[PDB]
Amino acid sequence: LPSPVVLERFESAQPVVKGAVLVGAAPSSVLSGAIAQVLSNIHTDSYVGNNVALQQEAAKVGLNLRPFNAGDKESKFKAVVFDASGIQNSEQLNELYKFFNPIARQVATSGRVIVIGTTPETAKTVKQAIAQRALEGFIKSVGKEFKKGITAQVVYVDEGAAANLESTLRFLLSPRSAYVSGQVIRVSKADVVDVDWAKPLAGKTALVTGASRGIGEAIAHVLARDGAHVICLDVPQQQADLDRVAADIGGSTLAIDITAADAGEKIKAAAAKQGGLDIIVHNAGITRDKTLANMKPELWDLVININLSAAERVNDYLLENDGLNANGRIVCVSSISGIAGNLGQTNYAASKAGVIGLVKFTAPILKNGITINAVAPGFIETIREAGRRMNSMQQGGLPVDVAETIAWFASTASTGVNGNVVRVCGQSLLGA
Amino acid sequence: QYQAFTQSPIGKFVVKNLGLPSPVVLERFESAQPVVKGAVLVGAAPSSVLSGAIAQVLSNIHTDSYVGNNVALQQEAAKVGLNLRPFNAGDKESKFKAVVFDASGIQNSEQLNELYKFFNPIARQVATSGRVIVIGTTPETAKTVKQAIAQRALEGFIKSVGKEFKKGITAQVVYVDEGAAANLESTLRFLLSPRSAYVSGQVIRVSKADVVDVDWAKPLAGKTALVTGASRGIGEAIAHVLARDGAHVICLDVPQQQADLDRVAADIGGSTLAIDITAADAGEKIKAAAAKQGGLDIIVHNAGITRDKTLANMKPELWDLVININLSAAERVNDYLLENDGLNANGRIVCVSSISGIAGNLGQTNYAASKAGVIGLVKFTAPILKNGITINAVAPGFIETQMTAAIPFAIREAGRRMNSMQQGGLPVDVAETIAWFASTASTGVNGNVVRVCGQSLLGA
């Protein structure tokens, strides 16, 4: 067996993409102007084949699209981006072949395959809905086949929501998404909001539960790296570690039990002096693994309470009592076990499938531009021989990989990212 | 080779998730009666709303049914004519072939412990080849957000039970749309029965529709079915089960397969149609072939091919052929039948996807695209169907066929081991699931994609 490729991860705000991007599009596509504008914004060398319509879209936004000689098998591209919105029926799925077959060996190590389509439920015809649905099978197979640490994603843009794609395209193009692969992201219509892309949380106040250690600590570091003032929450027994984490990020502490009845009240009170809470990350979670036959009742109850019920109560309080600011963010943490189940985890998997429902059925009732999304981490370094290699990256992920994905959800610019559950698993074999 | 696989990281991955291989010989269908061999234990959360419909099914199938100290459940079952015998909660010895729980009364996450209350005491008393069945309210139809969330959580529970209980036991969640309880029966019978032997870990949605009369012993009696790819393999097995259930089966396959088609049709009292399903006139010829038998009721799109190649090495025609046979040809035929009076009322379209359409696979960019498209064909055709017609798909996992010996060792070994049954499935397992969709009674089963995979570890 080979040992795993070393993945490229975030080093600095610029460049967003180190290396060249190759763009393609199907005939009659509608997202190419929005894609070209992002590539212009991030000042990357961008290339295109013999597609006049796509060349015209980049001209309209001032993107110098360097033509890519189709006889060139030697050049390497850090990302390949395909607008599939123009695929109108199953026979036009060969537009995927026409773009990706000629360059399938020219994606760089730690590269990116990104297919951008139209959300199948928003497609105007059944034939297009079917074709757009098929894109997920294609990208998941690419994710397993291309190797070299390359990730593969489909971004579905709701019909008419091209203006809302930028923060998602930026995340996927960048090394920040190093451990996100095989996934489906849905972009919906929302107001566009000004942002400093170098500090996309500047001026915001975030709260991270379970912040004193582990992934919660990593979350707090990335939110502070993006410009946020982070309130680090954990139980008073963890005050020393809370103080350590807060001192490392210029943050503050809130030492309470998130399951207490008054937790939402105290969270709102804590953020009042900063001008209110913008971002809450429900990272607090526990496992109490036991076969159901051996499991004690309180170990069922505790896992449901901390992992699910507690976040419900806090969300209910904040949303009903002006506890989150406009354009605010709720980010939850599910798990692959919540999607796929796991032996000894009837309690944990129930709780984390609950978290998926919390995201999916809260998202439609949010107002004031608030969004709710979740990450579903796979094998992250902190069954262990099992998890580690059983993914397209052939390695476990790092806490920063989960934190980067949470920070993309929390970005001031991700107004149109809502109701998503995105696995952070390097395309783990496991699933539903 | 086998010891090396076990010692390898994927072999250790299997053992950490499923334990060491202890597969069971799975019970499969033998006769229409009894539906369930053995006793059934029924339970319900407080304030549940599906227990009268569940009890009516258990009364219809004449199974020995038991209940704990749930007075409301006992009273509702008695009202609809079901005798529920008390199950002494101190009895760790009795075995149940099926345990059925009405979870519709779970109104929020704190009430998820009703799952623990019912299932923890009997977690070692489910029989070999038994059934765990949780029946809830479809989350998208729940009246409150809190209940939607709690009903969504049921899937994580049942998927974990499916991996934990072992012994060939399957675990399912059936979601019943609010108001659709009378449409549950064919699904509950399928899951209670050995017919569903290789279906586990799955989510089935029951929606509101007319309740139609049926002979449960011959649930396709009087109907005409067409099976594509019928001359061998899974298509042959589908044809056998549809005939077993009472249908006249038209077996369709390419003219080069005429000998095998003739052999299969004579084995089931059916007929043949020797055409290429991709032909522009395949829809016309299908309708013509059923015309002299009262028209076509059921079509099973089982024809399918692989042309496995990395995308870099794949030729254009090997992309095109896979999309055409596996996806575009079924679209054309459905479009023709649905627009030109080619399917009878209460008709059935059943498609075949694949785990690779859900999970992706190296060397299958073409095949996985085509089979993900099949999921879209089901999901986006279902809402526009009229006249009681339904469309569903099976998504088979690793099935033992005559083609399995051609699969390279490591892919085949992972296929056999990486599922909760710790074994590959049989073609009849796929056929039974298709037959349940095709049932004259399955009127409120529409738009479902159900994996037939023994709860394979793979997925999305």
Residue numbers in the entry:
A (entry chain B): 23 to 404, 414 to 463
B (entry chain A): 4 to 463
Paper text:
In contrast, bacteria utilise the FASII system which involves a series of discrete and functionally specific enzymes that produce fatty acids primarily destined for incorporation into membrane lipids.
After successful expression and purification of the recombinant protein, crystallography trials yielded two crystal forms with different space groups. Chain B of CF2 had regions of flexibility and poor electron density between residues 1–22 and 405–413 where it could not be built. The N-terminal domain displays a flavodoxin-like fold important for dimeric chain interaction and orientation as previously described. In terms of quaternary structure, both models complemented elution traces from gel filtration suggesting HMwFabG is a dimer in solution with protomers an approximate size of ≈ 48 kDa, also confirmed by SDS-PAGE. Overall, the general structures of HMwFabG proteins are conserved, and the catalytic C-terminal domain closely resembles the machinery used by classical low molecular weight FabG enzymes. Within the C-terminal domain of HMwFabG is the Ser357-Tyr370-Lys374 catalytic triad and Asn329 creates a kink in the α10 helix important for proton replenishment and this domain closely resembles the structure of a classic 3-oxoacyl-ACP reductase, including our FabG.
